[PDB]
Each structure stands twice: as C-alpha cells, then as structure tokens.
Amino acid sequence: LLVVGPKFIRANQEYTLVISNFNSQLSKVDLLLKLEGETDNGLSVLNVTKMVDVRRNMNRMINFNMPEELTAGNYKITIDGQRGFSFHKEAELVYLSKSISGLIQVDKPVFKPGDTVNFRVILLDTELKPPARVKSVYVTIRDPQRNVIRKWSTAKLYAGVFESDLQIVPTPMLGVWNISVEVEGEELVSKTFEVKEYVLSTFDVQVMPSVIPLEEHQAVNLTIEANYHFGKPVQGVAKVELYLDDDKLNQKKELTVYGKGQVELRFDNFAMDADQQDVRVKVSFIEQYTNRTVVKQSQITVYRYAYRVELIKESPQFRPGLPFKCALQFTHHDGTPAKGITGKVEVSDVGFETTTTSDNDGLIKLELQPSEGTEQLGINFNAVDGFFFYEDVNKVETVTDAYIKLELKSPIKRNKLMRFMVTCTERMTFFVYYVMSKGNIIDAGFMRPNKQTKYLLQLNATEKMIPKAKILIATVAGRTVVYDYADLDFQELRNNFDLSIDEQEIKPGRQIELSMSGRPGAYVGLAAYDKALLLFNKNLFWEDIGQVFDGFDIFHSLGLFARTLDDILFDSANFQESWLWKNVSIGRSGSRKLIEVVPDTTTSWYLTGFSIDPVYGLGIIKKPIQFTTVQPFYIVENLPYSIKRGEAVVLQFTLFNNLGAEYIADVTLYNVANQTEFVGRPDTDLSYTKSVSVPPKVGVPISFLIKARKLGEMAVRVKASIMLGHETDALEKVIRVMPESLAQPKMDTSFFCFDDYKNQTFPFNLDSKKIEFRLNPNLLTMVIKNLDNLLAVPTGCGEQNMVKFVPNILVLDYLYATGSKEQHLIDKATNLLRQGYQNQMRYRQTDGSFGVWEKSGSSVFLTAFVATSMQTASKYMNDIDAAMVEKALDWLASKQHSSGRFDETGKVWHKDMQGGLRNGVALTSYVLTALLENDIAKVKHAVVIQNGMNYLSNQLAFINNPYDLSIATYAMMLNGHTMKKEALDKLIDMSISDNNKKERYWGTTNQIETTAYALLSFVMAEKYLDGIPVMNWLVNQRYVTGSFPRTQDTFVGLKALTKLAEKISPSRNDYTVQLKYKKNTKYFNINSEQIDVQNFLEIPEDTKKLEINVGGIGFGLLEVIYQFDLNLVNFEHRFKLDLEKQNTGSDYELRLRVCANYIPELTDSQSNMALIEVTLPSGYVVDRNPISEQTTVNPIQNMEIRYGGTSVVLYYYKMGTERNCFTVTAYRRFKVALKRPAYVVVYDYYNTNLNAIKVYEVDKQNVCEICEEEDCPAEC
Ligand SMILES: *[C@@H]1O[C@H](CO)[C@@H](O[C@@H]2O[C@H](CO)[C@@H](O)[C@H](O)[C@H]2NC(C)=O)[C@H](O)[C@H]1NC(C)=O
Ligand SMILES: *[C@@H]1O[C@H](CO)[C@@H](O)[C@H](O)[C@H]1NC(C)=O
Ligand SMILES: *[C@@H]1O[C@H](CO)[C@@H](O)[C@H](O)[C@H]1NC(C)=O
Ligand SMILES: *[C@@H]1O[C@H](CO)[C@@H](O)[C@H](O)[C@H]1NC(C)=O
Ligand SMILES: *[C@@H]1O[C@H](CO)[C@@H](O)[C@H](O)[C@H]1NC(C)=O
Ligand SMILES: *[C@@H]1O[C@H](CO)[C@@H](O)[C@H](O)[C@H]1NC(C)=O
Ligand SMILES: *[C@@H]1O[C@H](CO)[C@@H](O)[C@H](O)[C@H]1NC(C)=O
C-alpha cells in the first residue's frame, strides 16, 4: 500500500486521502480509517471513522468533509488494516486557522536614531490573489519594552497591500522593535526591526592587497583603510609589519594615512615551496591625536601563476549512467577569463583524456559519460607551464539508484489537454499520480504501463487546478518508492510581472531608466537595499515571498504525508543608505517605465520588486537586479561643531580620487554672507581656492585657515573638482558660532484686550545689547512657531522630557476649542504629539509607573502627570496604549494612604511638590487634580479621589503655604467641593498686589507655577475680570519662545493663559498698532483674528524710550526682546563651584576636576534637581565615557553628551553642602588658535536665581603653531 493525503486541515476544507494497492499477495485490501481530533481544552472534536476496500492494482479516493466547527488542538489520520491484512500506520495533521497568509516588508534591517522605518504589509489568499474577504488589517508597532508606540486600528488594504511609516525619535529606545499585523482578531504575521546608536570614538581598519601578489613580483602592494563607525575617514599613522618566514620580522614601513593609503613592501628573495604561500602582515593604526591604536592582522596569499582554476559543475553531484557535463573556468588574478591556457585534462574513471586550450571565454568544457558503476570522478588537469588542478566529483546519494523522471511535454493551457513524458529505470507495471491545488489533492490515478519504461500521460486541466497546481508521480522499484514533482502554473492566468535596466552603464549621480512590464493596473512595489546593509542583519524578506510564489521531503513540501509498508523505504534525489522605496502602477498598456536618480555614492546595490493584481494575483522578478556604483571623486569634511568669534580655525578636508590616473584637484571655500574671513587675505574676498595633486585610491588632505565673523550658523560651503572639472563634488556643512559668555535674553511683555474701540499708549523704557520688537496676535503664535524646541535648558529627565509632549496637548486643546480653520497648525501639533508620546515611553518602569530616569527613579508626582497627560492626548491620537494608562493609574491608586494622602516614594527633586514637610498637601492636591481631569479616570477611580478630597477638606484651614493651597483650591474647583469657595478666598487673601502696575501674583519660591494654578481656579470660578491683573504678571514672566523659563511653569502656565484668553478675547480682531521711536514711526495692522502663523518683527536700534499706540478692538501681545552679549565672568549664588585642570602630560588631552555643592540658608539646606553643564574650549571633544572620579555622596543620575561632544550635561537628584565632584576627559581634535576661554555651570533646575558659573582657560594657541605654509602671516 501507498497511503497519501494532505498534512493540513481547514475549517470548511475537503480532505481527499488517496490509497493505492500494488500489494499483489491479496486480491483486495480491507481498511479502517479513523480521523480523530481534540481541542487544546481537551474536548473531542473529530471521530470520523470509515471502512473501505481497495482492490488490487487500483486507487481509491476517500473524502473526509470537515466540520465548520474546528479549533486548534491535536489531529491525526490512522489507516489500520482489517480482515487478513496486517497493516497499521498513522500520521499527525496540523490545523491552519487562516485561508490567508501575510508578509511584512521593511526597507532596512537596522535603524540609526533619527530614521524613518518604512514597511509594507502584504495579504495573500490561497490563490495568491488579494483576499476578497479582508478589506483592512490591524498593525501595531512595539518598542523594545513592548509599549504600543504606533497603531493602525483600521489599516485599509489596496490590492492587498498596506503601506506606512514610523519615525524613530532623536533619542529613542534602543533594541528590538516588533511590527505585528492582526486579521479578524488573530495575528497573521510579525516582523522585527532593530535600533542601534552608532556613536563612540571607535574605528575599524582593513588591509588588502591592492593587486594580488605574484611570486614573480617579489613584492606585496597594500591598500590600508581606516574609517570610523560614523563613516568618516580616520587620520593617523599606520605601522606596517611583514612576515615572510613564520614569526620572523622581514620588514617595517610606516605611513601617514588619511583614511586610505598605499604601501609597497619589497622582498629580497622569496622562493615558495608550493604554488601558493601565505604571508602574515600586521598593521597597527594609531589615531592622530589620541594615540588610540587598533591592530589588524591578515594572511595575504602569494601565487606562482597568473591564473586560478575552478570547476563549473552542471550539478553538485553526478547521476551514474547519465551524461554529466561540466567545465573548467580559467580566471585571471582579479578579473578576466584566461583566454588561451594550454593543458591536458584527464578523467581516468571514464578513461577521458583531452589536450586543449582554454577558449575566448576562458573555459575547457568536459562532457563526461560515467557508467553504471562509477564511484568518483577524478578530473585531473596538468598544464604546459606546470599548473596543477584536481577536484573530485561524487555520485548522487543513491537511496535506490533507480529513478523516475516526469517531463511536462507542452504548455499548460486551461481546459486544454496536459501532456507529460514519464521516464523510468525499470520496465513499469504501474505508476501513481497525484494533483495538488490549494493544499488538497484535486486528482489522482493508478496508471498501468505495459511493462514499459516510457509513458505519455494525458490529463484534462480542470477548473480546480487554476491557477497554480502541482503534480506528483510515484512508483516502486525493488522495495523502495521513487517519485518526481512537476509545476503546473497557468501562465495565461497569472501575474507576469518583469523589471529591467537600460542597455547603458550605471553612473552614480546620473539617472537610470527602469523598464517594467506586467498586468495593466496592477500594484508594483519597488525597493532597493544596500548589499552591505543585507550583511550581518539579514544573512531578508525576498526569500519569504520567493517561497510564497510556489509551495528534504518532497511530500511535506508538496503539503502531503506519505505512508507505506514496513519493509518499503523512500527515495531522496535532491556611509550607507536606503533608496527607491517607490510603488507604481503598470497602467496604460502593458508596461510603465519609471525614471530615477542613482545616489552619488560608492555602494553595491540590490534592487527588488513585486506586483499584485486584484484579478491575476502575485507577480515577482526572479533574481533581484544587482549592480555597484563607484563615485569617481569626493571630498570629506572634518570640522569642529562649534567655534567662537575671533578664534583662528583650521578646516580640514580629504579628497578621494577613484579615477584611473592622478589629477590635480581644486577645492574652493566660499565666503557666504560675510561669515568667513580667510586668514591673511583681503576681507572682501568672496572665495579662496587651493589646488592639490590627488593620486588614485589615496586620501589627500586639504585645509583652510579661517576666523568667524558673525555669530549664529556659519555655512561652510566648498566646491571641488578634479580632471579639469569633469568630476565635481560639493558639500554644505555648518559650524555653529557661539558667543563667549552664557547668554540669556530677557523679554518684557504687555497685553491688551479691547472689546470696544479703545485708544491707549503703552510706554517701553529700554533703559552691549540688541533689541527686537514683536507684536503677536495670539498667546500661542510664538509657542507654535517654536513647539519642537521651547526651552533654553536641557530636558533629559522624566519630568522635563514632557516639553516634547504637554505643550502639544495644550496647543491642540486651544485650536479645537476656538474651532481653528488653520488645519496647517493642528497637523504640526498632532504630529509632534505622537513623537512626544514615543519619546516619553522611555521613562516607563516595569511596574507600570513612570520614573525621572530611563532605567530607575520611579516617581508618584511624575506617574500622576504622565499617566493623566496621556489620557487627555487620547482624543488627539489613536496610537495611545489605553491599558498602559489604566495600569499606570492603578499603580498610583495603590500608593495612597488611608487618610487620602499621597507621599513621594523616591528622592526629592522638586521640593515644593514632593515635600512631605507640609502634610503632603502639594502632592495630594496634584494627584487629585490629575485624576479629576479625565472622565474615564474620574469614574473608574472615584473611591480613591473621594478619600483625597476629604483629606484636603480636613486640612483646609491648616494649609498656610501659597503653593500648596493653589493646587488644593484647583483640586476642589475641579471636584466641585463644598469648601471650594472657602479655599479660593483663602488663596486670594495671600495674593501680592501691585496696583501701580495692574499685576497680581502668588509668591515665594515657585511663583510662576503657584500663580498659574491660582488663575486656573479663577477662570474656573468665572472671575475673569479679576484674572486680568493676574495674567498681566504671568505674560510678563514668559521666556522669549512664548513658553515659560522651565518645564512645569510652562505646563501649568500656558494652560492658565489660554484658559482665560478663551473667555476674555473678543470674537474679532480689528486694530492698528503704531510704533513711535527715535525718528521713525512703524505701523502694524491686524484684521483677521483667525490667522495664527502671522509674524510682525521690527529691529529697534539701541535707542531710549519706546511708545506704542494701540487703537481698536481685539487681543494682542506687545513683546520687546532684549538679547545680551555680555562679558564671561565668574558668578556664584547659593552654589559653590570650583574647577581644577589636572596634569595629563599631553597637550592633546584635557582633564578637568569639577566641584559643586549647595550653599544652604535657614530651613533651605538642599536644592532641587540640579544640573551641571561642561563646555569645552573650541576644538576639544569628549570621548565615549568622559566622566571619572565620580563622588558617591550624590551620584550623577544621568549623563548627556550633546553638541558633537562640546557639551556634557549632568543630572543630579539634588545638592547639599557635601561636595559633589567628577572629572571630565576631553581631547584636542581640531587645530584652533587664539582660543577664547570656556566655562562650567551648575544650577537648580526649577529655581532660576540659584546658579554658579566658573571660567577656565586652556593653552590659547597661536596662528604660527597651526597654519599651513601658504596661509601663514609674515611673523612666522
Ligand atoms: C502606492 O501606495 C500608496 C499607499 O501608500 C497608495 O496611495 C493611496 O491611494 C489611495 C487611492 O488609491 C488613496 O485613497 C490614499 O489616500 C493613498 N495613500 C497615500 C498615503 O497617499 C497608492 O494607491 C499606491 N499606488 C500608486 C500607483 O500610487
Ligand atoms: C467513534 O465512533 C465510532 C462509531 O460510531 C465508535 O466505534 C468509536 O468507539 C468512537 N471512538 C471514539 C474514540 O469515541
Ligand atoms: C605596486 O605599487 C608600486 C608603487 O605604486 C609600483 O612600483 C609597482 O609597480 C606595483 N606593482 C604591481 C604589481 O602593480
Ligand atoms: C478530456 O477532455 C474532453 C472534455 O470535453 C473529453 O471528451 C475527454 O474524453 C477527456 N479525457 C481525456 C483523457 O482527455
Ligand atoms: C562683516 O561683518 C561685520 C559684522 O559685525 C561688520 O562689522 C563688517 O563691516 C561686515 N563687512 C561687510 C563688508 O559687510
Ligand atoms: C484715537 O486717536 C486718534 C488719532 O490720534 C484720534 O483722532 C481719536 O480721538 C481717537 N479715536 C477714538 C475713536 O477714540
Ligand atoms: C600621543 O603621542 C604624541 C607624539 O608626539 C604626543 O605628543 C602626545 O603627548 C601623546 N598623547 C597622549 C594622549 O598620550
């Protein structure tokens, strides 16, 4: 017996099991079949038991109809033999839930921080068409901590394809991410992608023979190449050591390498023993200024002959008895075919001997004929010049050595006859055939040849075979089963997509014509990967879709299982990038030719492309189109990130020439907008050109000596060209020109609100500096035109990093409230809200809470804030992990005391908020505030709230601190408490009033916050008019961006301001602003209250008084922004900072010892979350981990190396009197002369006034110590 059926079952699938009786002992065979099944629960699902007789020399096809109600578990078919026949074999069956399978394509395997992950999702049914059932999917992407960063709740498919993207933020969560698609609630497919940060001063060296060495050369030529992980070439010295005879030193050369270098190593006498001898070469690369060394060793092979030979076998093994063709490929050492090598090829095992010469294509073709008994084939080649080559060819792993071959003798048209040619070793009594389509046996048959070896098998192509089917033939020779498969693909009914390149060569930077043809109106999905990108990461989506295009067990591959008798056996006969993420339609007729620009870069490409027609299904190209591009010539910069005014700077560059010859290069550094003064040249010079000879495959330096003129951003503009201008390259890089001192701009603000036509005159005493006047028709115009960066301070902590999140909610809040017709803004804010969400997930802890730090530092304050913060944002973005919020609110709820009180579990970094020294009134009121602002949260946690509101009620007459009370009041105001009015009046009673200014604030330490909470409660209690003097103060405390100086104040402040201005600003703006100063009078007009992005500058020169006349109806802010360039000088206020530059014994290394401690006062003996910034003198750069000597009194909770290693930021928890110290290690990596001094700063985060700055000087170098001979002044 031969029992064969599918190995898979489906809900409503037929199961046709085909039994063949060739056993001739009996005249019939009686069989019992049981197909049992059991769910994962343990419930019995299947007990379909059938009995049948299979007569001699025929087939019986059995159908098992499957119950619609199948669920995954444990299934198997059992063919046990009844009556007089001893037979019992069984085979386990798998459940396939879906009639569809899916594919996730991603443009890269790994991503650098600021990248955009691109993905396609492809759904295909069992016919390789787009599923007519499924219209959309459910795609979510999770970060390395499983957080739901994005989500497509209803991702509509087009031609079974969903295309989308995801931006990885500036400072993201590193590791493995997880795209996962879901259909009808069941996960269909899942792909991972990685995110790694490629920083550090770590570099790689490679050594290779520039030309494959011959014995005849008596010399080794080398290419030495050292690049940083960044992609930039390394400058340094290469120490070369060559070893000809074992570990005995033969030679030592040294060369300065600028990324790429050539070295020649000559020998005295080198006679080899064989025709190939290895040579060990050690290279030691010493990084230019640090002296950091990387050693690379390699075995460089030397050869006797100028050619090598390989054997091009038609197949890896020969079938004994059948002609085995092959050839010898003669390859020149690196390159051509060896056209004309004479020799004799000898295969003794067939008795074949030929003396010939390699042809034009460099080949000698062997068409051997091994007989029935041939073990190995000894292909031996001996040449007239003595060259020797022998490689053995072995026979196919003969499980039988008696085969059956099936050959489809004509094209497979639908309905038309299918003709096949069966060839078999034995004279056949019988053969079986089976036909699979859509995972089940469609047709079978017991064919009986008349003791023949050949049979012309003729079958009708039925409709159940459309469009992809597969036929399988089997028979018995001896007591072993032999078989063969054949593909039955109706080409006339399938997607015949093809993609091609032009008949021209591919030049990097130039454009190429892509010619593709296929089904009209079909979807096409192009992608091009860097072949080097498919390195350690893929070694790849293409194989999966290649595998999905069609279909060593040739049954389990055909989707079947096979059983036979106990004595019968089975046979077995066997810089970088990402570009061209396009998707096009075949359209018009039968081909669409898209035209594209090849990236200007030295890289090996890999170009794929699939196609999906709604009718015709999937199409694919065979091998991905593959080429490489070598950019002829390019320049590479090596520039400091920041320089100061009046320092002399060497801008280094490196030219690479990849052309055949050595050509002179011109490099021209341009003076863009008076930015750049070339040292020793007339100031009116617009450019400066130098010219250098550049050898092939060698890096050559070229530098310019400059000093910066204007502050801000210096554009470093360079054009280059070799070979008379035939090959050009240019770069547009930027060095940032910093002031000498830590500059901080002040901004005085006035606001007007006129409902009825009103004239008024606002004076502005301006009392070195530069001034700018701004009129802004909305609180948020300055804010939104700054969103992505609102604060002058770093924000690398859980609380601070919310500036990327919260301000966006509030800007979205307002725009929807007022019903803004400026969708243009809403878009920016909504986009930034999402990226803000992702950024913040980095501060999620394991227990569901949020912490001040990435790894540690869990916090109650923060958890309340972040949790409820997100709950609000939910109405503006789909992507929020709804349960993740709930689980964060639940962590919070449990942390409450029995009184209803909340304490901060973990260190104190925001004192007024996290201080328990005042009944924890602050934190309690805050947490209650957070819960109350969300309708879901208010109901779900109502019991926790009720306990808190009572704790406040019992505390109300006891609260005597303005901060605490302001929130307690806000809580009650939101709550709708009975004692709300009381609370607010007790707050009002604490207010500082200045009637000679129309200002009202709430005092001591955290004024901006307290006052904001206060105003919120006002607007709540409809005290709008009384809120106007409150606002007047707040608006005047704003930072230049439109926000407030710090994090929290911004958050509560902007909230307060928008809230009042919602209820006080007139429905229509129609007014004129007259600006009188010095001599001039400027005029501004506002007539559309609508528009937000609406800028009104004017730069007053250093004048005296300033007089503004507002006339009409509307809202407005009159801002006057003083910006300061001051002298850099030491200052201390309630912090004591000290600097000491320890000795290193190297000019090219700075180590600075820094010491900072808080100066206490009265009850205040400890600071808030304190940061230290370290600025380096121009040219210096900090390494990977530049900090050492760290004190354990107060430990650095977080480090931030920003600004291309110019600045190190150091987050502490707090500072006491106990000295907190460390030591920075920087390296002078750029030539900068006349260096102006740097500084270190310590500050309290949430208290502006408490800070300390200390200046320090490094050896300020001179112009002569730095200039190249051409640019040098006479004094050298
Ligand atoms: C290429 O794929 C994109 C999906 O990114 C398809 O663009 C969508 O087209 C439909 C109409 O067919 C629109 O309703 C969507 O708004 C489009 N989405 C986007 C993001 O623009 C497009 O169908 C595909 N094919 C071609 C030829 O452009
Ligand atoms: C299944 O049903 C058949 C016939 O109805 C019976 O003979 C057999 O015992 C049953 N098997 C199981 C495992 O329940
Ligand atoms: C190796 O390079 C050196 C220097 O460029 C040259 O003298 C020699 O001809 C080269 N050898 C070969 C085999 O190209
Ligand atoms: C298949 O083709 C036609 C269907 O109309 C039929 O007449 C013929 O008998 C069939 N059989 C074979 C063996 O081709
Ligand atoms: C170039 O820069 C400075 C800007 O402070 C200015 O004083 C100087 O006159 C400028 N020169 C020209 C030609 O604009
Ligand atoms: C406002 O000022 C203008 C011009 O100075 C003056 O004519 C007028 O009295 C004022 N107008 C109103 C409507 O108050
Ligand atoms: C590196 O070696 C050079 C050799 O001149 C020396 O000047 C310098 O002091 C060394 N730097 C360090 C960091 O050891």
Strand 110-111 and strand 186-195: pairing? parallel
Q: Is residue 558 part of a domain?
A: no
Q: Distance from the CA of 684 to the center of ligand 5, in angstroms?
A: 10
- CA angle at residue 1086 from 1081 to 1092, to 5 degrees? 125
CB count, 10 Å around CB of 786?
17
Ligand 4 site, residue 456, Cβ cutoff 6 A: no
Q: Are 1135 and 1245 in contact (CB under 8 A)?
A: no
Q: Which of 1023, 1018, 1118 is nearest to 1074 (CA)?
A: 1118
Residues 259 and 407 in one domain: no
Say if 619 falls within a structural domain.
yes
CA of 244 from ligand 3 middle (Å) equals 19
- The CA 1069 to ligand 6 mean position distance, Å, reads 18
Q: Give the separation between CA 259 and CA 237, rounded to whole angstroms.
A: 10
In whole angstroms, what is the distance from residue 39 CA to residue 35 CA?
14
Contact 1128, 1256 (CB under 8 A): no
Length of the chain: 1276
Q: Is 163 in the pocket of ligand 1 (CB under 6 A)?
A: yes
* Cα gap 1157→1114, rounded to integer Å: 50
Distance CA 1177, CA 1224 (A): 13
The answer to whether 366 and 314 are in contact (CB under 8 A) is: no
At residue 1034, the 3 state secondary structure works out as: helix
Please give the structure tokens belonging to residue 779. Answer: 């609180």
Report the alpha-carbon distance of residue 307 to residue 727 in Å, rounded: 35
CA dist 1153 and 549 (Å) reads 65
- DSSP at 340: T
Task: Let me know if residue 701 belongs to a domain.
Answer: yes
Cβ atoms of residues 1129 and 1199 within 8 Å: no
Q: How far is the CA of 759 from the centre of ligand 6 (A)?
A: 6
**Ligand 7 pocket check for 1146: Cβ under 6 Å:** yes
Ligand showing the shortest atom-to-Cα distance for residue 460 = 4
For ligand 4, pick from 433, 460, 462, 465 the residue to mutate: most ligand atoms within 8 Å of CB: 460
Tokens 């939910």 correspond to what residue? 874
Beta strands in 976-1036 (DSSP E): 992-994, 999-1001
Euclidean distance between CA atoms 1043 and 806, whole angstroms: 12
Q: Does 645 lie in the same domain as 620?
A: no
- Angstrom distance (rounded) from CA 512 to CA 524: 18
Closest to 805 measured CA to CA, from 884, 868, 888, 883: 868
What is the number of other CB atoms lying within 10 angstroms of the CB of residue 732?
Answer: 10
Phi, psi of 1041 (to 5 degrees): -70, -15
Do 785 and 914 have their domain in common? yes
Give phi and psi for 11, each to the nearest 5: -35, -70
Task: Indicate whether 297 belongs to any domain.
Answer: yes
- What burial class does residue 803 get, using C-beta atoms within 10 Å of its C-beta: 0-12 exposed, 13-18 middle, 19+ buried? buried
For the chain, what is the domain count?
Answer: 10
Residue in 254, 1146, 1229 to alter for ligand 7 test, most ligand atoms within 8 A of Cβ: 1146
Looking at the structure, do residues 477 and 603 belong to the same domain, yes or no? Answer: no
Is 966 within 8 Å of 1013 (Cβ atoms)?
A: yes
Picking from 1207, 1184, 1204, 1188, the residue whose alpha carbon sits closest to that of residue 1196 is 1188
| The domain boundary residue, chosen from 99, 114, 147 | 99
Q: At what angle do helices 921-932 and 962-975 cross, to 10 degrees?
A: 30
The answer as to whether 318 is a domain residue is yes
Q: 757 CB under 6 A from ligand 6? A: yes
At a CB cut-off of 8 Å and minimum separation 6, what does 114 contact? 168, 169, 170
User: How far is it, in rounded angstroms, from Cα 659 to Cα 696?
Assistant: 6
With beta carbons less than 8 A apart as the criterion, state whether 649 and 642 touch: no
Q: How far apart are CA 779 and CA 1054, in angstroms?
A: 8
Beta bridge partners of 1171: 1211, 1243
Q: Are residues 919 and 805 in the same domain?
A: yes
Q: Among all chains, which residue has been given the structure tokens 């990236």?
A: 599
Nearest CA residue ID for atom 14, ligand 5 = 674
Q: CA gyration radius for the chain?
A: 40
Is residue 1233 within 8 Å of residue 648, measured between CB atoms? yes
In order of 19, 688, 717, 981, the CA distances from 685 in angstroms are 93, 7, 14, 72
Question: From ligand 3's centre to the CA of 221, what distance in Å?
Answer: 6
C-alpha of residue 419 to centroid of ligand 4, in Å? 13
At residue 202's C-alpha, the angle toward residues 201 and 208, to 5°, is 135
CA 702 remoteness from chain centre: 34
Which contiguous run of DSSP H or E holds residue 806?
A: helix 806-817
Q: Which residues pair with 227 in a beta bridge?
A: 204, 233
Q: What is the Cα–Cα distance from 909 to 1166, expressed in whole angstroms?
A: 10
Residue 171 CA to residue 843 CA, distance in Å, equals 12
Per the structure, the complete domain to which residue 665 belongs is given by 632-737
How far, in Å, from the CA of 1041 to the mean position of ligand 6? 33
First to last CA, the chain: 101
Contact 105, 120 (CB under 8 A): yes
Q: Nearest ligand to the C-alpha of residue 38?
A: 2
Tokens of 715: 């554009």
Helix (H, G, I), strand (E, B) or coil at 712: strand
Task: Please provide the DSSP assignment of 107-174 as one string.
Answer: S-SEE-TT-EEEEEEEEEETTSSPPSS--EEEEEEE-TT--EEEEEEEEE-BTTEEEEEEEPPSS---
- The reply to whether ligand 3 has any atom less than 6 angstroms from the CB of 577 is no
Query: Does residue 545 fall inside a structural domain?
Result: no
How many helices (H) and strands (E) would you count in the chain? 15, 77
624's CB contacts (< 8 A; 6+ apart) are 542, 606, 607, 608
- Which residue, chain included where needed, has tokens 């016919």? 127
Q: Which residues pair with 123 in a beta bridge?
A: 102
Instruction: Please indicate, yes or no, whether residues 720 and 621 belong to a single structural domain of this protein.
Output: no
Task: Tell me the C-alpha distance between 893 and 881, whole Å.
Answer: 19
850 and 895, same domain (yes or no): yes
Same domain as 613, residue 518: yes
CB 866 within 8 A of CB 798: yes
Does residue 661 form part of some domain? yes
569 located within any domain? no
Which candidate, 111, 112, 295, places its Cα nearest to that of 204? Answer: 295
Q: Which ligand is nearest to the CA of 1111?
A: 6
Distance 607 CA to ligand 3 centre (A): 37
Q: Which residues contact 289 (CB under 8 A, 6 or more apart)?
A: 1148, 1227, 1228, 1229
How far, in Å, from the CA of 713 to the mean position of ligand 5? 15
Which protein residue has the closest C-alpha to ligand 5 atom 12?
674
3-state class of 76 per DSSP? strand
Name residue 296's beta-bridge partners: 283
Q: Which ligand is nearest to the CA of 708?
A: 5
Structure tokens belonging to residue 1270: 């051409």
**CATH code for the domain of 177:** 2.60.40.1930
**Chain Cα centroid distance, residue 265:** 44
d(CA 1116, CA 1123): 22
Q: Kindly report the protein residue whose alpha carbon is nearest to atom 11 of ligand 6.
A: 759
Cα dist from 262 to 165, 255, 637, 1185, whole Å? 44, 9, 21, 34
Question: Using what technique was this structure determined?
Answer: X-ray
User: Cα 1138 from chain centroid?
Assistant: 41
Ligand 3 pocket, mutate which of 210, 215, 260, 264 (most atoms under 8 A from CB): 264
| Angle, vertex CA 114, rays to CA 113 and CA 119, nearest 5 | 95
**Contact (Cβ atoms closer than 8 angstroms) between residue 1040 and residue 1052:** no
Last residue of a domain, one of 200, 234, 255: 200
* Of 32, 47, 74, 80, best ligand 2 pocket probe by most atoms within 8 Å of the beta carbon: 47
Task: Please calculate the CA angle 732-737-743 and round it to the nearest 5 degrees.
Answer: 145
Atom 11 (ligand 5) nearest CA: 674
Q: Determine the Cα–Cα distance for residues 25 and 56; give it in Å rounded to an integer.
A: 9
Ligand 4 centroid–CA 460 distance in Å is 6
Distance CA(779)–CA(1053), nearest Å, equals: 11
Angle CA(54)–CA(56)–CA(62) in degrees, nearest 5?
25
Same-domain check for residues 75 and 145: no
- Asked whether 460 lines ligand 4 (CB < 6 A), one says yes
Protein residue with least CA distance to atom 5, ligand 3: 264
Regarding whether 1264 and 1199 lie in a shared domain, the answer is: yes
Last residue of a domain, one of 305, 334, 355: 305
The angle subtended at Cα 703 by Cα 507 and Cα 1272, nearest 5°, is 155
- Decide if 1141 contacts 1130 (C-beta within 8 A): no
623 CB contacts (<8 Å, ≥6 apart)?
A: none
Q: How far is the CA of 162 from the centre of ligand 1 (A)?
A: 9
For residues 460 and 518, state if they share a domain: no
Q: What is the helix (H) or strand (E) element at residue 1076, kind and residue range?
A: strand 1070-1076
Beta carbon of 1111 within 6 Å of any ligand 6 atom: yes
Q: Are 1167 and 1256 in the same domain?
A: yes
Q: Cα separation of 326 and 321, whole Å?
A: 15
Q: Is the CB of 291 inside a 6 Å radius of any atom of ligand 7?
A: yes
Protein residues with CB under 6 Å of any ligand 5 atom: 674, 709-710
Instruction: Identify residue 282 by its one-letter amino acid code.
Output: K
Residues contacting residue 476 through CB under 8 Å, at least 6 positions apart: 22, 430, 482, 568
The CATH number linked to 240 is 2.60.40.1940
Q: 460: Cβ below 6 Å to ligand 2?
A: no
Token duo for residue 210: 């520039």
